């Protein structure tokens, strides 16, 4: 079936907390915090998605989970560009990082919303 609304929120809290930390690091130009923030966010997002089936039956759940997971992966994909092992544009980079964080938060709400109606 579906997880409870209370459980979804409970997992969402750890997601928003880490995204806030990411936004905080972006405002202070602490780009070295981008990678570990994306790691924290990914792990929190992963735990949230674990509440829902791997292959969900409903369509809104399937689409929201897809966006949630892809954005989380896309987030640490962008954050990985902060460290070139061997020129880095932080302006273009931070724009993409925030948009990913937004998409994660957006998909998180969609999951809470569809769960509330079923409660």
């Amino acid at each position: 079936g579906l997880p409870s609304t209370e459980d979804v929120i409970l997992k969402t809290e750890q997601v928003t907390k880490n995204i806030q930390e990411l936004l905080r690091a972006a405002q202070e130009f602490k780009h070295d915090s981008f990678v570990p923030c994306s790691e924290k966010i990914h792990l929190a997002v992963t735990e949230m998605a674990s509440l829902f089936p791997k292959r969900p039956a409903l369509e809104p759940v399937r689409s929201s989970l897809r966006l949630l997971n892809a954005s989380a992966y896309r987030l640490q994909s962008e954050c990985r560009k902060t460290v070139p092992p061997e020129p880095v544009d932080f302006q273009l980079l931070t724009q993409q990082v925030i948009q990913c964080a937004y998409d994660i938060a957006k998909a998180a709400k969609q999951l809470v919303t569809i769960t509330t109606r079923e409660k």
């Binding site: 806030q20 405002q27 724009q95 925030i98």
Partner: peptide, 21 residues
Amino acid sequence: SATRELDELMASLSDFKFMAQ
């Protein structure tokens, strides 16, 4: 309640995006 706080974050993220634009 909980929906609002997430809306606050989304608003904050979108608000910050304009600052870099």
